[PDB]
Amino acid sequence: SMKWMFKEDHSLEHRCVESAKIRAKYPDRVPVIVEKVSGSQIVDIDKRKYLVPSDITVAQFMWIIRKRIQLPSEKAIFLFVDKTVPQSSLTMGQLYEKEKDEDGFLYVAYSGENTFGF
């Protein structure tokens, strides 16, 4: 399974309130939690929390992550939302409305392989 440190560090109600707070303050931005898939052949990420405009695409968000972890261009990266790889052409706003957690955050896992899910 995916075990999210964000959810282990904060109660459901804490996250519900905080997600609602940023969405009220920044209605055109989506709060994203990013964590590495356990065991993956990829470096862990230093920045876990992102507030990204809804107008960037999934491909663009992947680029942001790749750059954060200094992943070489020739080396692949896969994102997973609820165990499926999202389509790169979607906007982060579309992804958020279709996959947001019960707590109002969007949880995106990343890996160097797509053996984890669909």
Instruction: Give domain limits for the chain.
Output: 1-118
77 backbone φψ class: left, alpha, beta (φ>0; ψ -120 to 50): beta
Place of tokens 């491909």: 59
Nearest to 98 by CA among 44, 58, 48: 58
Report the greatest alpha carbon distance in the chain.
Answer: 41
Phi, psi of 25 (to 5 degrees): -80, -30
Q: What angle do CA 90, 6, 26 make, to 5 degrees?
A: 50
- 32 close to 47: Cβ distance less than 8 angstroms: no
> Determination method here?
X-ray
